[PDB]
Design a binder for this molecule. Sequence first.
Ligand SMILES: [Mg+2]
Ligand SMILES: [Mg+2]
Ligand SMILES: [Mg+2]
Ligand SMILES: [Mg+2]
Ligand SMILES: [Mg+2]
Ligand SMILES: [Mg+2]
Ligand SMILES: [Mg+2]
Ligand SMILES: [Mg+2]
Ligand SMILES: [Mg+2]
Ligand SMILES: [Mg+2]
Ligand SMILES: [Mg+2]
Ligand SMILES: [Mg+2]
Ligand SMILES: [Mg+2]
Ligand SMILES: [Mg+2]
Ligand SMILES: [Mg+2]
Ligand SMILES: [Mg+2]
Ligand SMILES: [Mg+2]
Ligand SMILES: [Mg+2]
Ligand SMILES: [Mg+2]
Ligand SMILES: [Mg+2]
Ligand SMILES: [Mg+2]
Ligand SMILES: [Mg+2]
Ligand SMILES: [Mg+2]
Ligand SMILES: [Mg+2]
Ligand SMILES: [Mg+2]
Ligand SMILES: [Mg+2]
Ligand SMILES: [Mg+2]
Ligand SMILES: [Mg+2]
Ligand SMILES: [Mg+2]
Ligand SMILES: [Mg+2]
Ligand SMILES: [Mg+2]
Ligand SMILES: [Mg+2]
Ligand SMILES: [Mg+2]
Ligand SMILES: [Mg+2]
Ligand SMILES: [Mg+2]
Ligand SMILES: [Mg+2]
Ligand SMILES: [Mg+2]
Ligand SMILES: [Mg+2]
Ligand SMILES: [Mg+2]
Ligand SMILES: [Mg+2]
Ligand SMILES: [Mg+2]
Ligand SMILES: [Mg+2]
Ligand SMILES: [Mg+2]
Ligand SMILES: [Mg+2]
Ligand SMILES: [Mg+2]
Ligand SMILES: [Mg+2]
Ligand SMILES: [Mg+2]
Ligand SMILES: [Mg+2]
Ligand SMILES: [Mg+2]
Ligand SMILES: [Mg+2]
Ligand SMILES: [Mg+2]
Ligand SMILES: [Mg+2]
Ligand SMILES: [Mg+2]
Ligand SMILES: [Mg+2]
Ligand SMILES: [Mg+2]
Ligand SMILES: [Mg+2]
Ligand SMILES: [Mg+2]
Ligand SMILES: [Mg+2]
Ligand SMILES: [Mg+2]
Ligand SMILES: [Mg+2]
Ligand SMILES: [Mg+2]
Lengths: 108, 50, 88, 245
Amino acid sequence: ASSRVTYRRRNPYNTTSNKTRIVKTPGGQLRVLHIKKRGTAPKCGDCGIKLPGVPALRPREYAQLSKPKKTVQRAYGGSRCGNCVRDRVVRAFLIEEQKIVKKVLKEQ
Amino acid sequence: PSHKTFRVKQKLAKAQKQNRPIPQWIRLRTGNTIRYNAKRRHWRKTRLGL
Amino acid sequence: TKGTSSFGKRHTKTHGLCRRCGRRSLHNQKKVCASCGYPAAKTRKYNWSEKAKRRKTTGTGRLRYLSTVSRKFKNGFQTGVPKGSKGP
Amino acid sequence: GRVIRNQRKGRGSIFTANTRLNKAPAKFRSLDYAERHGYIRGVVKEIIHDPGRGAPLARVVFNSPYKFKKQRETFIANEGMYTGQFIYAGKNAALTVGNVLPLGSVPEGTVVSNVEEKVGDRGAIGRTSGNYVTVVGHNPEEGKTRIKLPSGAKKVVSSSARGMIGIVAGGGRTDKPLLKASRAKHKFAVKRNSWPKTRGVAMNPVDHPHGGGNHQHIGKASTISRYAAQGQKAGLIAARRTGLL
RNA sequence: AAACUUUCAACAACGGAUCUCUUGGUUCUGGCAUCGAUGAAGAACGCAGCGAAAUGCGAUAGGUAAUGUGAAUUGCAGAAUUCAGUGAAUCAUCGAAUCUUUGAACGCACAUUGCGCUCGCCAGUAUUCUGGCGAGCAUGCCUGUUCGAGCGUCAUUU
RNA sequence: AUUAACGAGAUUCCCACUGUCCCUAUCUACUAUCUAGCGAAACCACAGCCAAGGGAACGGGCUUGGCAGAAUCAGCGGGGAA
RNA sequence: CGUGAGCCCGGGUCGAACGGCCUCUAGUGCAGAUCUUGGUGGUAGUAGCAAAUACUUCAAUGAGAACUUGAAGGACCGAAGUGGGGAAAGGUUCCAUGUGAACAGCGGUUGGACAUGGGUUAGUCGAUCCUAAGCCAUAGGGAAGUUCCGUUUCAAAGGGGCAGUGCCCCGUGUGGCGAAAGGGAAGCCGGUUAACAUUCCGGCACCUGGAUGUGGGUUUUGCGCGGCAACGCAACUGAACGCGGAGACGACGGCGGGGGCCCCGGGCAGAGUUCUCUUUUCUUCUUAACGGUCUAUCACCCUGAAAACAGUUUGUCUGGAGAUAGGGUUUAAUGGCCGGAAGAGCCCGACACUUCUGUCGGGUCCGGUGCGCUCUCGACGUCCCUUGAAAAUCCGCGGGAGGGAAUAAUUCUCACGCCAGGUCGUACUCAUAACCGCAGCAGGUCUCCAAGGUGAACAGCCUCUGGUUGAUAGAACAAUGUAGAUAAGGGAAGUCGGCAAAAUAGAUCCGUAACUUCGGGAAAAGGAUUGGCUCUAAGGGUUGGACAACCAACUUAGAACUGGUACGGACAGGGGGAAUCUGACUGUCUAAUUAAAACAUAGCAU
RNA sequence: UGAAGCCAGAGGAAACUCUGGUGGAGGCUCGCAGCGGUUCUGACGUGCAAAUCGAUCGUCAAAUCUGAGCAUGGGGGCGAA
RNA sequence: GAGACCGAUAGCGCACAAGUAGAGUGAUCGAAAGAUGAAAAGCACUUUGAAAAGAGGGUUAAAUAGCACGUGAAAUUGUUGA
Ligand SMILES: [Mg+2]
Ligand SMILES: [Mg+2]
Ligand SMILES: [Mg+2]
Ligand SMILES: [Mg+2]
Ligand SMILES: [Mg+2]
Ligand SMILES: [Mg+2]
Ligand SMILES: [Mg+2]
Ligand SMILES: [Mg+2]
Ligand SMILES: [Mg+2]
Ligand SMILES: [Mg+2]
Ligand SMILES: [Mg+2]
Ligand SMILES: [Mg+2]
Ligand SMILES: [Mg+2]
Ligand SMILES: [Mg+2]
Ligand SMILES: [Mg+2]
Ligand SMILES: [Mg+2]
Ligand SMILES: [Mg+2]
Ligand SMILES: [Mg+2]
Ligand SMILES: [Mg+2]
Ligand SMILES: [Mg+2]
Ligand SMILES: [Mg+2]
Ligand SMILES: [Mg+2]
Ligand SMILES: [Mg+2]
Ligand SMILES: [Mg+2]
Ligand SMILES: [Mg+2]
Ligand SMILES: [Mg+2]
Ligand SMILES: [Mg+2]
Ligand SMILES: [Mg+2]
Ligand SMILES: [Mg+2]
Ligand SMILES: [Mg+2]
Ligand SMILES: [Mg+2]
Ligand SMILES: [Mg+2]
Ligand SMILES: [Mg+2]
Ligand SMILES: [Mg+2]
Ligand SMILES: [Mg+2]
Ligand SMILES: [Mg+2]
Ligand SMILES: [Mg+2]
Ligand SMILES: [Mg+2]
Ligand SMILES: [Mg+2]
Ligand SMILES: [Mg+2]
Ligand SMILES: [Mg+2]
Ligand SMILES: [Mg+2]
Ligand SMILES: [Mg+2]
Ligand SMILES: [Mg+2]
Ligand SMILES: [Mg+2]
Ligand SMILES: [Mg+2]
Ligand SMILES: [Mg+2]
Ligand SMILES: [Mg+2]
Ligand SMILES: [Mg+2]
Ligand SMILES: [Mg+2]
Ligand SMILES: [Mg+2]
Ligand SMILES: [Mg+2]
Ligand SMILES: [Mg+2]
Ligand SMILES: [Mg+2]
Ligand SMILES: [Mg+2]
Ligand SMILES: [Mg+2]
Ligand SMILES: [Mg+2]
Ligand SMILES: [Mg+2]
Ligand SMILES: [Mg+2]
Ligand SMILES: [Mg+2]
Ligand SMILES: [Mg+2]
């Protein structure tokens, strides 16, 4: 027998917006379902590693999630990774302390 | 094509109503010269030029 | 292969319909009519083609308004009603 | 005849530069109060490749002294620069690689790059891969500095003209043969439409001053006067000499 | 001898010459001066009882109002109450109107019946959102109005 | 000047191979062929047998001879300076 | 009658005007001009209607049937199709009913022909929105002018708040067009028509925008808790301004996961074959969007501190900047399970029936394998003097403005509840008949899906699903043809010339020269084997402690036997060598007589 | 076919050199579709066709092929010429 | 309003549904086509045929005017006669 399928839209070309996956329907027919692109996980602003705890969706889909689902409960939330936030705390403290040490050295 | 561009679809409606034969009663009008539709168009003969 | 073979590759429709003159002469890339020259205010016509002006001149259409001007002048541009017409 | 090939290049429309992949141009930041009396500090965020150039670019981020904003700017990276480096630009900047200093505050014999002829013209001289400008000497009486250009020509510029300490990155690029018509093709495909070149002597008299004849030859001398009439300049224009050096 | 080929006549074919005509052209002469932002010329789409084109007209659509004539229109029924009619007609005249989408075309565009903004009214729990309806929003220039800018500049307070 | 590799480039030779050839023969399909239906075009002064002579010096026509019997079908490529 | 151009008369047809004479006037006399326009011949019932393998029997319809229809038989396309859809282009060719002529280069009862009617339903598909290459306004500057440049400039350019005006805040900067293949909010299944379907009907969802109630959450020192941590939970304030991410990106290679297809078993049903044989040959055994829940590479966190270095991939990378090990967190579903949902669809069997097409019963299952094919995802790797779009839009964070209850307020980023989603396209063909080529033309025209066998293989050949049987036919078998072929002996003597054809050809094993830029030449040259049948051996996985048991499908090697010594048995499938001239090589051009030594190229030089 | 890189073993006093694997580079190579157009100087040559048809052939991972949008306009364009 | 003009291959390209049908991507190019009869009185009815039509019959002054329509030349063709 034959199991070939057809596009369900008038775009006949193998473009990025014309991606399909084959399913089998309850009626016993092989059909195609047009699927959107898969989302990309948000990256860290400093190092660029995939941020844990936040889902990977298309940009418009993030408007549908609740606030806790789009971020972690740390300082820089779902924007910077934990290792980069830890470095920022140490950098801010150490450099500020060195500025004080440099200060008191200047007047004396 | 199936994508019609409404302005174009409006011209195609005009072209098929114009492609009719002449009513019989016109051929009897006491001074008539009209005998047959001399502006008949067929899709296999002449292009609409749209 | 510049003949019968090359005519098969011809499905591109350089010229489209024009809003001003209704001819299929509006260049699609230049957006300029080849007959009436319509990106512009002034209708295109030249004295080196007497036939082209003749096809486009004033007597070739309905004359929706000029046909009545001749009658208005002959009566001297009257106003009002003919001396006691019915109804105000 | 007809219009020859070098005449058609000035009109453009196929001879324009391809710049879709080229982002913001490589130049200094505008001269301001901070750099004129003092220095300002920036951070090299990342070093990038600019198509058709051959020397890497570095995007450096500064702080706006007036607006609470970060001013992005793309310099031309020097051999030694790295991401996370601190860049200091100003009259009082220290003399290290990657710092932008006025030429008047830099000792003779040094090596700088992206020198500017005029104060405010944000970078003019020494911008290709392995090229650099050498400071020959100073003259502080009127504020003028004598430099040496990559071509070997000496020149006098304002002592307030800026420059980046070091040598531009990517040196030695032209030391590797291309070996292939592809490698030349890809080299010029991102620059402009100038490859390949047909030989004028292989053309027809309608097409080029050299074309024609029953043998491929140039009828007259290839040396063309300095003031030829825009279509005669199809050879060695105003050659003081010719032949092997 | 027939057939075939060639010639002529009668009749019959093919073809549309000739003759006669003509709501057409052409040239001359006489008279007149009147397009348009109060939206022209042109274009598109529609409108008839039964119409494709031509002609006419524009959702008031082979047309309305008004005036004159005075019994039609016509290919068929449909007007016979319109017969004193206070009025037929594809009539003539024409001074009142209607005049779709466009077009110099004027909210921005238009290869889209696309996208806007202001005011008023109506409906939906609505000053903000949605729908319907109406009136609007181009550029240059002129006169005036009002609101301003400039240590250009005057005087006073200061 | 010389060059390994490469070449639907030009050239010579050798091996294999074969109908290129000695020297032709045979087979199959579709035509050509006959029939029903349908049905053009190029070309065309008039036409259409030769020999010799003369002639604008290579005639279908002229002159002198040879001759010469309806109507046709399939091939053919001498001539019609086709 | 006249020398003549012409004139006159008789006979036939015809139906409305015409003539002589004297002067005046002219667009006034045709055999030609490769004359112009129209019409008609011989040729001539002639050339021809010959590519794409192919049709036959019966019956019906009808005046008439090779090319109408039904049945039966025989065939072809053979999944890079003669199949199922579309983009451009076309415009009603779509469907039903009927039909004289014309068209379908033969016929025609048939038709993309003719005549009359009917047919295209969207918040979810696309346009519309964004920007790209680019185009056009504005400010200005040229030009006699039609207009040219200019797109952020040498411009007083704009955008919002509070109660037709008033009062405030910011401003660096201030337009539009441009993609039915780029970016992008959201719909799936079943049924239904002569012709529409992600659009109608039934069921079940989703997004955006606007309003707004209940429940729940927070708060009586005002804006949540838990975990060491990676982070989690149903919520859990957040102004200007600023920061970051997504959108957002190359080609190729092997590997791993998943969906679909293919393949192999067993079971329940049905069909085919049955001289004999085959527990046999074939077919159905299905599960959408969507709401959850449990897992799946990388990576990250905690303990701990490694040489006798260890972990580890097909591929050698990682580790005192913290590895192995142990315990966890997390991005990733086209994965399992539940709902949707068996009530659907499908397959059998039993009866109704005048039609309406009605009713009922049963079933709709369980495993395995793989360098299999296709799509997709992921981690690695290679290449670059090549590094492989932008914008609309959305989100997170920093910041802390304003506001906020102790008797009620409050987040309307939690659940449920309410309202609305405008405009245009939507039929059909997508081609050996619906597009372009004067045409129903062997030409040309972008793309998706892609079964079985043989075989390395979308090679050729045969078959299944689906689709055709359309191209003027019948009879003979002359010459000459076009296409396909075979020839004894010789083997290029033919010819300008081995032009054309033949020969070689797959796989395995052996053997391989001069020369050389050391990379090649090289498949050099040149040899041997190949079938069928019966066996044997090797190459694995899982669970229980050099073992035992239960699975698995391919590859390689060895040996007997066997045959008219045949075996890549069809298909498919290099002829080779010795040199000379020339261009280094790959690449390109004279569309429609020249593909070359010409052009180009890297390299060199000026 | 088998370049870098990687693994194992062997030889040597050393310098270092060999062998077997793995790996999968190349404007490499045979070859199907696509693209092109060498020969038959084949068919046709009032053709299917105002350039096609058949066999044979060149290339086939890239200086390969290609759609749509856009730009260049006549003494002008564009040209691996 | 006229003409010592043209008279349907003439006169304007257009005496007619003419700047129309049609061609070209486009700028543009651009035809052919008048006449039954005074009046449709445009052939009722019968018969052969599937039908188109034919034969009778009828209208008209005339069908030797049948919408292929005033007259109807020649090229070219058929029958009869010589
Ligand atoms: Mg798209
Ligand atoms: Mg989370
Ligand atoms: Mg094209
Ligand atoms: Mg040349
Ligand atoms: Mg010259
Ligand atoms: Mg030469
Ligand atoms: Mg005689
Ligand atoms: Mg003779
Ligand atoms: Mg002769
Ligand atoms: Mg004589
Ligand atoms: Mg004689
Ligand atoms: Mg001859
Ligand atoms: Mg012959
Ligand atoms: Mg008369
Ligand atoms: Mg004359
Ligand atoms: Mg004459
Ligand atoms: Mg004559
Ligand atoms: Mg002639
Ligand atoms: Mg014949
Ligand atoms: Mg033939
Ligand atoms: Mg495929
Ligand atoms: Mg298709
Ligand atoms: Mg049909
Ligand atoms: Mg026929
Ligand atoms: Mg017939
Ligand atoms: Mg402009
Ligand atoms: Mg747009
Ligand atoms: Mg789009
Ligand atoms: Mg359909
Ligand atoms: Mg529904
Ligand atoms: Mg809580
Ligand atoms: Mg991004
Ligand atoms: Mg993209
Ligand atoms: Mg399920
Ligand atoms: Mg969905
Ligand atoms: Mg770890
Ligand atoms: Mg999923
Ligand atoms: Mg693919
Ligand atoms: Mg990678
Ligand atoms: Mg539809
Ligand atoms: Mg459809
Ligand atoms: Mg369709
Ligand atoms: Mg198709
Ligand atoms: Mg056509
Ligand atoms: Mg044409
Ligand atoms: Mg196999
Ligand atoms: Mg195959
Ligand atoms: Mg045929
Ligand atoms: Mg010889
Ligand atoms: Mg050629
Ligand atoms: Mg050639
Ligand atoms: Mg050369
Ligand atoms: Mg090929
Ligand atoms: Mg060929
Ligand atoms: Mg030939
Ligand atoms: Mg021939
Ligand atoms: Mg392209
Ligand atoms: Mg008569
Ligand atoms: Mg008559
Ligand atoms: Mg007559
Ligand atoms: Mg005659």
